[PDB]
């Protein structure tokens, strides 16, 4: 039953202090997810460099 305490402790210790991968890959997917919502937003203004100067 102690083997049960150490498993969870050694898990979350790594997660919090050392590194967490459930903190990494979800965001690494958000990297490609956000690029779609980044682009047209100020492509409209990149083409409004046209609609204001060109």
């Amino acid at each position: 039953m102690a083997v049960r305490i150490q498993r969870r402790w050694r898990g979350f210790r790594i997660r919090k202090y050392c590194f967490n991968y459930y903190y990494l890959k979800e965001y690494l997917r958000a990297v490609s997810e956000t690029n779609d919502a980044i682009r047209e937003a100020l492509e409209e203004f990149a083409e409004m460099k046209e609609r204001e100067e060109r």
């Binding site: 083997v3 049960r4 150490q6 498993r7 969870r8 402790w9 050694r10 898990g11 979350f12 210790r13 790594i14 997660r15 050392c18 590194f19 967490n20 991968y21 459930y22």
Partner: peptide, 11 residues
């Protein structure tokens, strides 16, 4: 331990 799960040293 960085993959959500938290194994024992024995597991």
């Amino acid at each position: 331990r960085s993959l959500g799960q938290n194994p024992t040293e024995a597991e």
